[PDB]
Ligand SMILES: Cc1cn([C@H]2C[C@H](O)[C@@H](COP(=O)(O)OP(=O)(O)OP(=O)(O)O)O2)c(=O)[nH]c1=O
Ligand SMILES: Cc1cn([C@H]2C[C@H](O)[C@@H](COP(=O)(O)OP(=O)(O)OP(=O)(O)O)O2)c(=O)[nH]c1=O
Ligand SMILES: Cc1cn([C@H]2C[C@H](O)[C@@H](COP(=O)(O)OP(=O)(O)OP(=O)(O)O)O2)c(=O)[nH]c1=O
Ligand SMILES: Cc1cn([C@H]2C[C@H](O)[C@@H](COP(=O)(O)OP(=O)(O)OP(=O)(O)O)O2)c(=O)[nH]c1=O
């Protein structure tokens with residue numbers, strides 16, 4: 169948990185966030201455990217969806233899209249390693265709904281760089297016993 | 304998947320719905336794969352939460368409670384082995400939100416007994432490719 | 439870890455015993471660990487056998503049939519999951535030979551509902567340091 | 574397959590049959606899959622049993638002892654790999670009971686050196702679609 | 709067959725973890741990717757607990773005890789409880805012949821590398837042993 | 845660890861050294877952990893390599909040939925179990941190169957029978973933590 173190591177991880181989240189394909193906001197989220205990146209998620213439409221555009225015609229977000237934290241945890245369910253006891257490097261502070269599942273997933277600590285508009289997500293993670301660090 | 308085994312799976316879903324401490328609705332969700340129940344999830348408040356009562360007064364559901372699908376999905380993240388290519392036995396038809404993550408998790412089919420008030424998740428499921436059976 | 443969840447597992451064991459085609463006695467046994475039902479076995483003929491019938495033409499039990507415990511054990515052998523540390527829910531008390539293999543399997547505890555005429559299997563379990571509870 | 578690799582596995586069985594303490598008969602059984610020894614078992618008392626001697630005070634076999642094939646299967650259960658689609662190398666042809674479970678496990682083929690007194694184990698193995706080879 | 713923006717994202721991840729190498733003659737990184745997950749990030753350096761994390765001797769040449777990024781990547785996979793078989797590799801620098809041997813036997817499908825090393829002969833071993841190679 | 849079983853592990857390494865197609869020397873390596881053989885490797889050309897002959901016409905060794913230790917190491921990377929905390933049984937003492945990787949892998953101890961021409965490999969193991977016993 170060396171400051172040089174943690175920076176490389178947060179920079180990895182930022183770098184996978186640049187795949188997002190969304191134009192509103194590009195969000196990334198990786199799962200880190202035992203020196204391994206078990207899942208990297210970013211915001212976008214479901215797999216095999218008829219479009220990878222995240223926006224509607226009024227430029228608002230397609231309700232079908234999944235958050236970064238959503239995709240990361242869903243991917244973990246698809247993987248064969250556990251998410252429990254792992255850490256989470258987000259480019260943005262997570263959504264309150266996502267924070268609910270992140271805590272229930274037994275994630276010990278969530279790292280976020282940028283603060284989203286709304287900040288109740290951080291507040292949910294803390295109530296549910298998950299340590300938070302801004303970097 | 305003989306139909307006497309399919310029933311046993313579905314009744315197992317109902318058994319674990321009965322241990323839920325929500326009184327608006329008791330919902331259970333089962334993950335089945337290779338002759339194994341990898342996760343049994345029921346609706347309720349997060350782990351270590353101060354109260355295990357899922358209601359507010361108003362008869363309203365506490366915004367912090369997790370769906371039976373959310374829990375089953377999260378436990379699949381929590382543990383090893385994969386939710387991918389598995390089948391889901393629910394007591395009630397799942398909501399739009401969970402049906403998004405279910406499809407992204409590569410769940411082949413969703414088995415549900417009761418149809419909820421609104422049935423958009425059912426039509427969200429087969430629109431994202433997940434097969435759907437009512438029993 | 440909870441009495442109602444405990445009662446759910448045992449009632450799941452009874453659900454699967456009813457799937458058995460056997461006429462003499464329908465036995466079920468499931469493998470539980472970390473909230474996951476890793477194996478659920480019931481008595482019957484081996485896979486692909488010419489009959490799913492468990493009895494010969496004189497009413498006695500076919501020597502090719504497997505116990506519920508044998509199947510619960512064998513599926514763990516077919517699994518990519520470990521039976522070591524698991525607990526066992528059976529509708530009946532396992533036979534001396536199954537018990538012999540159950541202890542060697544590293545099963546912490548055996549739950550059982552119906553006491554079987556001849557109870558040496560229980561005795562074998564206690565002897566080999568396996569916790570046993572009737573319910 | 575290659576001939577000299579085949580002999581290596583079989584004499585490994587004879588090698589581990591020799592670490593058994595039983596005097597009546599020393600049996601060894603190795604499970605092989607994808608060119609890997611996933612389990613090696615021999616006959617003896619359960620783990621942590623008070624004595625490692627397998628004989629009664631009259632030369633008979635303690636009904637508590639495990640067959641080499643039994644330990645090989647139980648070990649596979651504790652293992653985190655599948656015995657399904659594997660090959661088994663025994664020093665002696667297995668008994669009917671183990672033969673039942675061997676077939677149910679999904680064992681492709683059984684290699685054996687010595688042919689036991691009673692040969693109805695090979696019978697059982699063959700009827701259940703398990704190929705057999707003496708070497 | 710990998711989407712170009714993701715393929716780029718992994719290769720840059722290898723470059724990020726190569727910056728932790730502590731070696732000063734050349735910083736090497738190696739990523740193990742299977743099923744969209746990064747199972748191992750390895751970089752060149754001394755072994756665990758070694759008296760120095762300094763990779764070089766008094767003359768500017770590499771300490772023989774220094775492990776390659778590819779060695780660390782595969783050793784990690786060995787200690788790791790997942791398989792390296794059927795996975796692909798992201799290297800900042802093309803692997804050496806000795807490592808390429810182990811890489812091939814490890815059942816690695818493909819090797820992406822960004823920097824061509826002075827000596828090609830590592831890539832030769834990869835290609836001849838049926839492991840795909842792509843420079844980017 | 846028991847003497848009867850420690851020798852069985854060593855002889856197992858020798859059985860697998862005998863399947864090497866190298867006429868220059870025949871080496872074998874066994875990984876043992878929690879009383880189980882996890883990997884077995886010997887010296888030879890890579891898999892699917894056009895020839896299985898380890899030597900050139902000059903008589904010297906083909907540089908494509910892996911040591912018995914690289915094979916045991918790689919097979920462990922291919923494996924789904926962990927090499928860290930295990931013991932390594934070798935027919936001959938490993939080279940310094942393989943010794944570095946052995947040490948980094950967290951191998952507790954290395955049993956060996958024959959010392960190689962060069963004995964530098966042992967010294968490297970000693971220095972890097974790995975315990976060494978000649979047997
Ligand atoms: C591959 C991958 C996808 N995702 C997310 C991003 C998207 O929301 C969703 C998949 O997006 P889409 O990648 O674009 O996947 P696809 O199968 O539809 O491929 P294409 O659109 O090019 O035909 O899953 C991750 O979070 N992590 C990953 O590693
Ligand atoms: C054990 C278990 C929990 N859950 C869910 C239900 C709840 O929403 C959530 C937490 O349940 P809580 O069971 O009540 O567990 P707890 O750790 O909070 O213990 P207690 O509340 O008594 O102090 O976990 C499942 O969905 N399936 C399961 O098998
Ligand atoms: C599926 C399943 C089978 N078994 C056991 C019970 C039986 O003894 C054995 C084989 O059962 P049979 O289910 O009836 O399987 P089958 O393929 O032979 O049936 P069919 O020919 O009609 O397709 O497997 C379990 O113990 N648990 C399980 O979940
Ligand atoms: C370790 C091991 C044991 N067994 C079996 C053989 C025995 O019947 C049983 C127990 O082996 P023994 O281990 O040697 O008995 P133990 O566990 O009580 O140890 P000790 O007697 O020295 O106190 O497990 C195998 O079949 N394969 C193995 O690799």
Ligand SMILES: Cc1cn([C@H]2C[C@H](O)[C@@H](COP(=O)(O)OP(=O)(O)OP(=O)(O)O)O2)c(=O)[nH]c1=O
Pocket residue numbers: 203749750751752753754755756757758761775777780781
């Ligand atoms: C942690 C880690 C180490 N390594 C390698 C790099 C090094 O060569 C080797 C050990 O590195 P050292 O990180 O420096 O670890 P250490 O236990 O010696 O701690 P310190 O030196 O600070 O006292 O393992 C990787 O390849 N990937 C990783 O994630």
Ligand SMILES: Cc1cn([C@H]2C[C@H](O)[C@@H](COP(=O)(O)OP(=O)(O)OP(=O)(O)O)O2)c(=O)[nH]c1=O
Pocket residue numbers: 575608609884885886887888889890891892893895896910915916919
């Ligand atoms: C199966 C196996 C192979 N190996 C190594 C030894 C060799 O160096 C390498 C390749 O062996 P090759 O046995 O000869 O196997 P192959 O896939 O090349 O088949 P073929 O007969 O056509 O050549 O694998 C081990 O170290 N341990 C093992 O258990």
Ligand SMILES: Cc1cn([C@H]2C[C@H](O)[C@@H](COP(=O)(O)O)O2)c(=O)[nH]c1=O
Pocket residue numbers: 190192193194195210211222228229233234235236237260261262263266284
């Ligand atoms: C808040 C939040 C937003 N996002 C993405 C989803 C949308 O495509 C993008 C634009 O934000 P908005 O649509 O919520 O205004 O934000 C995440 O991926 N994770 C989050 O936690």
Ligand SMILES: Cc1cn([C@H]2C[C@H](O)[C@@H](COP(=O)(O)O)O2)c(=O)[nH]c1=O
Pocket residue numbers: 325327328330345346347357363364368369370371372395396397398419
């Ligand atoms: C719609 C839906 C509700 N539930 C739970 C949420 C609450 O625990 C309970 C009451 O829901 P309601 O408040 O939306 O009526 O139903 C599920 O578990 N799955 C579902 O799909």
Ligand SMILES: Cc1cn([C@H]2C[C@H](O)[C@@H](COP(=O)(O)O)O2)c(=O)[nH]c1=O
Pocket residue numbers: 460462463464465480481482492498499503504505506507531532533536
């Ligand atoms: C003793 C025992 C019997 N059985 C089954 C075997 C047959 O299906 C049925 C008949 O047994 P019986 O012939 O010994 O009475 O009981 C089990 O499934 N598990 C057991 O432990």
Ligand SMILES: Cc1cn([C@H]2C[C@H](O)[C@@H](COP(=O)(O)O)O2)c(=O)[nH]c1=O
Pocket residue numbers: 595597598599600615616617627633634638639640641642665666667668671689
């Ligand atoms: C038949 C058989 C016996 N054995 C063991 C049981 C005792 O350890 C020893 C003597 O068997 P017996 O006393 O049944 O003749 O042989 C096996 O390990 N595998 C077998 O298949």
Ligand SMILES: Cc1cn([C@H]2C[C@H](O)[C@@H](COP(=O)(O)O)O2)c(=O)[nH]c1=O
Pocket residue numbers: 731733734735736751752753763769770774775776777778801802803804807825
């Ligand atoms: C060739 C090669 C070198 N390296 C490291 C060894 C030293 O750390 C550094 C200098 O290489 P050199 O000393 O072999 O020229 O590069 C790798 O990590 N992987 C490789 O494939």
Ligand SMILES: Cc1cn([C@H]2C[C@H](O)[C@@H](COP(=O)(O)O)O2)c(=O)[nH]c1=O
Pocket residue numbers: 866868869870871872886887888898904905909910911912913936937938939942960
């Ligand atoms: C030194 C060493 C050689 N070998 C093999 C390499 C060749 O197969 C054979 C000849 O070694 P050499 O050619 O390096 O003297 O011995 C090992 O398997 N392990 C070792 O540690």
Ligand SMILES: [Cl-]
Pocket residue numbers: 244245246247248249250251379380381382383384385386
């Ligand atoms: Cl998982």
Ligand SMILES: [Cl-]
Pocket residue numbers: 514515516517518519520649650651652653654655656
């Ligand atoms: Cl298993």
Ligand SMILES: [Cl-]
Pocket residue numbers: 785786787788789790791792920921922923924925926
């Ligand atoms: Cl591994």
Ligand SMILES: [Mg+2]
Pocket residue numbers: 213214215216217219220
């Ligand atoms: Mg897409």
Ligand SMILES: [Mg+2]
Pocket residue numbers: 348349350351352354355
């Ligand atoms: Mg609670």
Ligand SMILES: [Mg+2]
Pocket residue numbers: 483484485486487489490
């Ligand atoms: Mg049948």
Ligand SMILES: [Mg+2]
Pocket residue numbers: 618619620621622624625
């Ligand atoms: Mg003992």
Ligand SMILES: [Mg+2]
Pocket residue numbers: 754755756757758760761
């Ligand atoms: Mg260091």
